[PDB]
């Protein structure tokens, strides 16, 4: 149809399903979509970007390099913006982590060139046992 609000009827469905964390018991809710909308405007970023598959991608670009020295305020954003972004990119995740990895994989070439100082340690890989 047309473009309005952040998450439409369909998106709202999957959104409520997605969880803030993989090992948590607090699913996603409108409270998180609005909580970020009010926090975005504070960072000179209009909340209108949250309802755009493009904006969500840009917002993450500024938080990506900020994650290094970002507080709970930053992490929270990257969390919501993540699950939301995936939704707008025709992606269906289960938690905030799954939605995060999907992005890190698309910008894996950029990440490598954005952590020279943080490129002197091991990086163990996580496997999936259950479903
Ligand atoms: C009056 C407040 C207004 C309000 O309702 O604001 C909506 C929320 C903040 O409120 P909250 O939902 O209570 O806070 C969250 C819970 O304690 C959760 O258990 C914890 O997870 P874990 O990582 O510890 O499992 C979250 O991370 P930490 O930052 O604690 O790590 C924490 O933010 O905005 C957000 O930041 C959500 C962004 C996705
Ligand atoms: C226009 O906005 C895009 C159309 C999205 C495809 C529709 C599939 C979702 C099912 C719609 C019915 C929802 C009834 C609550």
CSV table of C-alpha atoms and ligand atoms in Angstrom, one decimal:
chain,number,residue,atom,x,y,z
A,1,UNK,CA,0.0,0.0,0.0
A,2,UNK,CA,1.3,3.4,1.0
A,3,UNK,CA,3.9,4.6,3.5
A,4,UNK,CA,2.9,5.8,6.9
A,5,UNK,CA,3.9,5.4,10.6
A,6,UNK,CA,6.9,3.3,11.6
A,7,UNK,CA,5.7,-0.3,11.5
A,8,UNK,CA,2.5,-1.2,9.6
A,9,UNK,CA,0.1,-3.9,10.6
A,10,UNK,CA,2.3,-6.7,9.2
A,11,UNK,CA,5.5,-5.3,10.6
A,12,UNK,CA,3.9,-4.8,14.0
A,13,UNK,CA,3.1,-8.5,14.1
A,14,UNK,CA,6.6,-9.7,13.6
A,15,UNK,CA,7.9,-6.8,15.7
A,16,UNK,CA,6.0,-7.9,18.8
A,17,UNK,CA,7.5,-11.4,18.2
A,18,UNK,CA,11.1,-10.3,18.0
A,19,UNK,CA,12.8,-10.2,21.4
A,20,UNK,CA,15.2,-7.5,22.7
A,21,UNK,CA,17.7,-10.4,23.4
A,22,UNK,CA,18.3,-14.0,22.4
A,23,UNK,CA,18.2,-15.2,26.0
A,24,UNK,CA,15.7,-12.8,27.3
A,25,UNK,CA,12.0,-12.9,28.1
A,26,UNK,CA,11.0,-9.4,27.1
A,27,UNK,CA,9.6,-9.3,23.6
A,28,UNK,CA,9.5,-6.1,21.5
A,29,UNK,CA,6.7,-3.5,21.9
A,30,UNK,CA,5.7,0.0,20.6
A,31,UNK,CA,7.4,1.3,23.8
A,32,UNK,CA,10.7,0.6,22.1
A,33,UNK,CA,9.7,2.1,18.8
A,34,UNK,CA,8.7,5.4,20.5
A,35,UNK,CA,11.5,5.4,23.0
A,36,UNK,CA,14.0,5.5,20.1
A,37,UNK,CA,11.9,8.1,18.2
A,38,UNK,CA,12.3,10.5,21.0
A,39,UNK,CA,15.9,9.7,21.5
A,40,UNK,CA,16.7,10.1,17.8
A,41,UNK,CA,15.4,13.7,17.6
A,42,UNK,CA,17.8,14.5,20.4
A,43,UNK,CA,20.8,13.4,18.2
A,44,UNK,CA,19.8,15.8,15.5
A,45,UNK,CA,18.1,12.8,13.8
A,46,UNK,CA,14.4,13.1,12.9
A,47,UNK,CA,12.2,10.1,13.9
A,48,UNK,CA,10.9,10.0,10.3
A,49,UNK,CA,14.0,8.0,9.4
A,50,UNK,CA,12.8,5.1,11.6
A,51,UNK,CA,10.0,4.5,9.0
A,52,UNK,CA,12.5,4.3,6.2
A,53,UNK,CA,14.5,1.3,5.2
A,54,UNK,CA,17.2,3.8,4.1
A,55,UNK,CA,17.2,6.0,7.2
A,56,UNK,CA,17.5,3.1,9.6
A,57,UNK,CA,20.6,2.0,7.7
A,58,UNK,CA,22.2,5.5,8.0
A,59,UNK,CA,21.4,5.8,11.7
A,60,UNK,CA,23.3,2.6,12.3
A,61,UNK,CA,26.3,4.0,10.4
A,62,UNK,CA,26.7,6.7,13.1
A,63,UNK,CA,26.1,4.3,16.0
A,64,UNK,CA,28.4,1.7,14.5
A,65,UNK,CA,31.6,3.6,15.3
A,66,UNK,CA,30.0,5.0,18.4
A,67,UNK,CA,29.4,1.5,19.9
A,68,UNK,CA,33.1,1.5,20.8
A,69,UNK,CA,32.6,4.3,23.4
A,70,UNK,CA,28.9,4.3,23.6
A,71,UNK,CA,26.8,4.0,26.8
A,72,UNK,CA,23.5,2.2,27.5
A,73,UNK,CA,21.9,5.0,25.5
A,74,UNK,CA,23.8,4.1,22.4
A,75,UNK,CA,23.5,0.3,22.7
A,76,UNK,CA,19.7,0.6,23.2
A,77,UNK,CA,19.4,2.6,19.9
A,78,UNK,CA,21.5,0.2,17.9
A,79,UNK,CA,19.3,-2.6,19.3
A,80,UNK,CA,15.9,-1.1,18.3
A,81,UNK,CA,17.2,0.4,15.0
A,82,UNK,CA,18.5,-3.0,14.2
A,83,UNK,CA,15.3,-5.1,14.7
A,84,UNK,CA,13.4,-2.3,12.9
A,85,UNK,CA,15.8,-2.0,10.0
A,86,UNK,CA,15.6,-5.7,9.3
A,87,UNK,CA,11.8,-5.4,9.2
A,88,UNK,CA,12.0,-2.7,6.6
A,89,UNK,CA,14.5,-4.8,4.6
A,90,UNK,CA,12.1,-7.6,4.2
A,91,UNK,CA,14.0,-9.5,6.9
A,92,UNK,CA,12.4,-11.7,9.6
A,93,UNK,CA,14.5,-12.1,12.7
A,94,UNK,CA,13.8,-13.6,16.1
A,95,UNK,CA,15.8,-11.4,18.4
A,96,UNK,CA,18.0,-8.2,18.4
A,97,UNK,CA,21.1,-10.3,17.9
A,98,UNK,CA,20.0,-12.1,14.8
A,99,UNK,CA,19.0,-8.7,13.3
A,100,UNK,CA,22.4,-7.3,14.3
A,101,UNK,CA,24.5,-10.0,12.7
A,102,UNK,CA,22.6,-9.6,9.5
A,103,UNK,CA,23.9,-6.1,9.3
A,104,UNK,CA,27.4,-6.8,10.4
A,105,UNK,CA,27.6,-9.3,7.6
A,106,UNK,CA,26.5,-6.7,5.0
A,107,UNK,CA,29.0,-4.2,6.3
A,108,UNK,CA,31.7,-6.7,7.3
A,109,UNK,CA,34.0,-5.0,4.8
A,110,UNK,CA,33.5,-1.7,6.5
A,111,UNK,CA,33.8,-3.0,10.1
A,112,UNK,CA,37.2,-4.4,9.3
A,113,UNK,CA,38.3,-0.9,8.3
A,114,UNK,CA,36.8,0.7,11.4
A,115,UNK,CA,38.6,-1.0,14.3
A,116,UNK,CA,42.4,-0.9,13.6
A,117,UNK,CA,43.1,-0.5,17.3
A,118,UNK,CA,40.6,-3.3,18.1
A,119,UNK,CA,42.3,-5.7,15.6
A,120,UNK,CA,44.8,-7.4,17.9
A,121,UNK,CA,42.6,-10.0,19.7
A,122,UNK,CA,41.0,-13.4,19.0
A,123,UNK,CA,37.5,-13.7,17.7
A,124,UNK,CA,35.8,-17.0,18.6
A,125,UNK,CA,32.7,-18.0,16.5
A,126,UNK,CA,29.4,-19.0,18.0
A,127,UNK,CA,27.6,-22.1,16.8
A,128,UNK,CA,23.9,-23.0,16.9
A,129,UNK,CA,22.8,-26.1,18.8
A,130,UNK,CA,19.1,-25.7,19.4
A,131,UNK,CA,16.4,-24.0,17.3
B,1,LIG,C1,10.9,5.3,32.1
B,1,LIG,C2,11.6,4.6,30.9
B,1,LIG,C3,10.8,4.7,29.6
B,1,LIG,C4,10.8,3.4,28.8
B,1,LIG,O1,9.8,2.7,28.9
B,1,LIG,O2,11.9,3.1,28.0
B,1,LIG,C5,12.0,2.0,27.2
B,1,LIG,C6,13.4,1.4,27.2
B,1,LIG,C7,14.1,1.7,28.6
B,1,LIG,O3,13.3,1.2,29.6
B,1,LIG,P1,13.3,-0.3,29.9
B,1,LIG,O4,12.6,-1.1,28.8
B,1,LIG,O5,13.0,-0.6,31.3
B,1,LIG,O6,14.9,-0.8,29.8
B,1,LIG,C8,15.5,-2.2,29.2
B,1,LIG,C9,15.3,-3.4,30.2
B,1,LIG,O7,15.7,-3.2,31.5
B,1,LIG,C10,15.9,-4.7,29.5
B,1,LIG,O8,15.7,-5.8,30.4
B,1,LIG,C11,17.5,-4.4,29.3
B,1,LIG,O9,18.1,-5.6,28.7
B,1,LIG,P2,19.5,-6.5,29.1
B,1,LIG,O10,20.5,-6.1,28.0
B,1,LIG,O11,20.0,-6.0,30.4
B,1,LIG,O12,18.9,-7.9,29.0
B,1,LIG,C12,17.7,-3.1,28.4
B,1,LIG,O13,19.1,-2.9,28.2
B,1,LIG,P3,20.2,-2.2,29.2
B,1,LIG,O14,20.4,-0.8,28.7
B,1,LIG,O15,19.6,-2.3,30.6
B,1,LIG,O16,21.4,-3.2,29.0
B,1,LIG,C13,17.0,-1.9,29.0
B,1,LIG,O17,17.0,-0.8,28.1
B,1,LIG,O18,14.2,2.0,26.2
B,1,LIG,C14,15.3,1.3,25.7
B,1,LIG,O19,16.4,1.6,25.9
B,1,LIG,C15,15.0,0.0,24.8
B,1,LIG,C16,16.0,0.0,23.6
B,1,LIG,C17,15.8,-1.4,22.9
B,2,LIG,C1,1.5,-1.5,1.1
B,2,LIG,O1,1.6,-0.9,2.1
B,2,LIG,C2,2.4,-2.8,1.0
B,2,LIG,C3,1.6,-4.1,1.0
B,2,LIG,C4,2.1,-5.2,2.0
B,2,LIG,C5,1.7,-6.6,1.6
B,2,LIG,C6,0.5,-7.1,2.4
B,2,LIG,C7,0.8,-8.4,3.2
B,2,LIG,C8,0.4,-8.3,4.7
B,2,LIG,C9,-1.0,-8.7,4.9
B,2,LIG,C10,-2.0,-7.5,5.0
B,2,LIG,C11,-3.3,-7.8,5.8
B,2,LIG,C12,-3.2,-7.2,7.2
B,2,LIG,C13,-4.5,-7.3,8.0
B,2,LIG,C14,-4.4,-6.9,9.5
